[PDB]
Design a protein around this ligand. Structure first.
Ligand SMILES: [Mg+2]
Lengths: 524, 524, 75
């Protein structure tokens, strides 16, 4: 495939336009008072939306290059969200702010490498300032606080989160299920979650969450790399006539059997999904046996002689639910006997007596934790089905912000925190005069989100900006009600993680661009 | 798929032209004296029509964007009709009136957010004014009144509705069937209706109603999510050789078996249709058992061990009719034994003794209501088949306006009510001078329907408008006979619901547009 | 405007221009609101005849050499 190669300025100009289109489409939705974007849909009536994540998803341009620009900012802003729970749009909005101004600078004839240095410093500095502005969120009161705010003034959502964390810990695994009655429920149940994601996006059966939700499936606990689909035919035919889904946990699943299971589900007979086993090497042995115990399943080790062709349902584990996403698997309510699960705990607890390393002690402890520590489930109750799966959605939203608030605290939400940290470090210098421009570009970028919220509301940016700057701490403007005050008191907050992630991620991609000299892509 | 992105003004101009083509094509048909639109039809001679709903359905434009404009108004105006029973055209006509004038304003350089505020106030105010102008319709006399008027002076149609409501209540379910003789019939019969619609439009066998009419079918009452077509083969082969249709009510039906059943009917052997079960969770258990009892069918619960592969006709329910639409299923005349249906009633009635919540008491009451309350059927009698299915049509029209008249009353029907409420709130102000413009745009939009009716008749709009304004209450112009008078006395009325809905819906889409800054769609 | 301003006092031509672009922008927006231009004019004119009196009231004589140097300088 012959390529089209663009250099230095050309390359960058293309990139700039690319990112502007992304940002100009996505940014008009930022405030509590965003504007709508209309998103066409092949069949039927179009989609009107104020949701930046939705708009972004749709952005792809004809001019490759220009497209690359847009796609780059999209990638990184989505990672922000990935790591924090929000900021996708903010990250984009800031990404544009640096990219525009920095990229003008380079084109004016200033030094790219210095401009990046300056920005990177301004960010490093503001990140610190953010930690300072940050108000911790630690006690049950504070947990429920950010929960309720994040769930839109609903005090009962704040409660349920606070209660869950109060039961299984700030670390413990909390999931959300559909409610059976009008009543909310909180139950703790034998279960577990491990940092391993789906082997294929085509496993997703809930497109809106980018997640795999499987109803009381059997669980296959293999120990080899599943490459051939042949080993499957006995077990995949039993879990077919059992009319139930099937979760596979093994070393891996290679294309040969992966791509088959893929097309086998996406419009096909048995609907299933598979994920890699937790841990590597000597750890995975016992780490997999833990899940076995928890689900009352049998581990099919090759090192024992058993094959997958020599496996029936009686070998498969079982759990009342299981959700998989990009990079997490969590199984809910394992049928494994209490006498067994408590027995395994006693075995591992004893093994901690070894204490040959603070790595081995801490590693065996993480295993005790997952197993006997369990998974807390929230069932969201509501009156109507519409209300239900809507409330259920805000509960997941709040849980997200709360986990994040715990880790790094909360700050002024209106763009405010960024506007604040910026007016703090307004002396900042570098060595190059070029690095100064770098710091300033970055600093002035930090006003973008507030300025934009205000603008979307149809108020003057400069004027609200100026008066937010005129204050201190978390004093800001609440665009929804047009009153200045303490943003946190007024219930307009962002978890510290998210404001930071957003900024850092916007800064990364901007630096990357400011330092790009070549761009390679296919011919039109 | 690379998109084409348009901003601010561009986006809006495109949208405007889109909407104008829709409205200019659809509005010429509004009065009692509409003009014809000719609608081409691939094979055979074209269609000449004065029916705005028919014209609208056909409108789709080449220019995407322009198209999105048109599709947007179409969507919202159809919802008007969805919730009220009429106004599809009116909604469109008004939608154009706001969109034109509001959108010029924004382009002149006035504030969108304020223009929306202004419109939205003007509407809020007029809706109130409408409630004031409104005349109740409550007693049997008034029911039969709006019925007869809505059915074109036919006093017997007004009677039959009044009688039906008089038998099963103002809420009770009333359906219409083809008549067997020359005589009208009204019978009450064991049956039920629940708020759940077809899983696929390709189930529709009466294209003109957008509805599914199935003649004395078997009813399958599953309890699981039907995903695989395999569970079906025994039951779907029995109801094939029985030469009868089949209704499925279960948790859901997933593509795998849905898309198959779809192609299986749309030009295929067994003609069937399926809908989700009423309610969710603990409610659906008994809620589904109710339909079982009513149809004398057996519920196939997975929680008992029975599968669909283990099911014969003896398990399927039966009803003499069943109609499904967008979002309603109603079954007519269930074969379930009287000793059984009355028995179940006794069970539920007793269960109301619990009274642990005003939610549980009221929820068990809604169940008693559906079951022992029944469905009233009107059989439309006529001399000829043409007359028959024509009278049958007006009976359904009338029933629509009457259900609506009961809920919210009636008002002057020639546009008149709108013209009236507008000249009332002709002082209304906002804070922004821009908000004023908003109010005025909206107010003057409210004259659109009358002005248009008059125009279509070939009379002067301004002159008729002015003299309708000059009066009070329900004084208006009757374009059919060209006399002024009391519109209600003269038998030209709209249910209050429909005039309101029309207005609100037109106002929603207009504001949406006045606040659209970006438009994303596929490349030409 | 810019040209007449200049024949009149040989200064302020940009100001003048700026003011005109401003009256016009705003005025046209009001014509688009459906106001009667001839009245928009009368209002503008009334506003101005008034503004001119106001100015003659704020004016203080410039007669010392320091003040003269100040207008020169600013110019
Ligand atoms: Mg000068």
């Amino acid at each position: 495939a012959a390529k089209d190669v663009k250099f230095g300025n050309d390359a960058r100009v293309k990139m700039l336009r690319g990112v502007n289109v992304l940002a100009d489409a996505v940014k008009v939705t930022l405030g509590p008072k965003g504007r709508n974007v209309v998103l066409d849909k092949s069949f039927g009536a179009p989609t009107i939306t104020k949701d930046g994540v939705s708009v972004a998803r749709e952005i792809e341009l004809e001019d490759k290059f220009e497209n690359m620009g847009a796609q780059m900012v999209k990638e990184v802003a989505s990672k922000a969200n990935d790591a924090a729970g929000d900021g996708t749009t903010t990250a984009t909005v800031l990404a544009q702010a640096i990219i525009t101004e920095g990229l003008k600078a380079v084109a004016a004839g200033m030094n790219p490498m210095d401009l990046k240095r300056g920005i990177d410093k301004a960010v490093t500095a503001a990140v610190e300032e953010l930690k300072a502005l940050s108000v911790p969120c630690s006690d049950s009161k504070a947990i429920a606080q950010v929960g309720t705010i994040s769930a839109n003034s609903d005090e009962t959502v704040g409660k349920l989160i606070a209660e869950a964390m109060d039961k299984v810990g700030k670390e413990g695994v909390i999931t959300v299920e559909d409610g059976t009655g009008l009543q909310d429920e909180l139950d703790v149940v034998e279960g577990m979650q491990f940092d391993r994601g789906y082997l294929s996006p085509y496993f997703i059966n809930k497109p809106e969450t980018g997640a795999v939700e499987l109803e009381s499936p059997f669980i296959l606990l293999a120990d080899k790399k599943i490459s051939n689909i042949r080993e499957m035919l006995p077990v995949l035919e039993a879990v077919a006539k059992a009319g139930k889904p099937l979760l596979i946990i093994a070393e891996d699943v290679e294309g040969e059997a992966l791509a088959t299971l893929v097309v086998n589900t996406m419009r096909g007979i048995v609907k299933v999904a598979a994920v890699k086993a937790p841990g590597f090497g000597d750890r995975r042995k016992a780490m997999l046996q833990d899940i076995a115990t928890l689900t009352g399943g049998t581990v099919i080790s090759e090192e024992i002689g058993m094959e997958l062709e020599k496996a029936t349902l009686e070998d498969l584990g079982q759990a009342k639910r299981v959700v998989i996403n990009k990079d997490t698997t969590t199984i809910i309510d394992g049928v494994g006997e209490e006498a067994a699960i408590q027995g395994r705990v006693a075995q591992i607890r004893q093994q901690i007596e070894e204490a040959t390393s603070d790595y081995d002690r801490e590693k065996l402890q993480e295993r005790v934790a997952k197993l006997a520590g369990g998974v807390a489930v929230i069932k969201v109750g509501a009156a109507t089905e519409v209300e239900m799966k809507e409330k259920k959605a805000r509960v997941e939203d709040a849980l997200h912000a709360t986990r994040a608030a715990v880790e790094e605290g909360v700050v002024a939400g209106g763009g405010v925190a960024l506007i604040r940290v910026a007016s703090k470090l307004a002396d900042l210098r570098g060595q190059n005069e070029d690095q100064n421009v770098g710091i300033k570009v970055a600093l002035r970028a930090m006003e973008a989100p507030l300025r934009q919220i205000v603008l979307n509301c149809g108020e003057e940016p400069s004027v609200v900006a100026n008066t937010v700057k005129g204050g201190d701490g978390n004093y800001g403007y609440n665009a929804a009600t047009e009153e200045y005050g303490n943003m946190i008191d007024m219930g307009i907050l962002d978890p510290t993680k998210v404001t930071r992630s957003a900024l850092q991620y916007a800064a990364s991609v901007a630096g990357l661009m400011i330092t790009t000299e070549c761009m390679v892509t296919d011919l039109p």
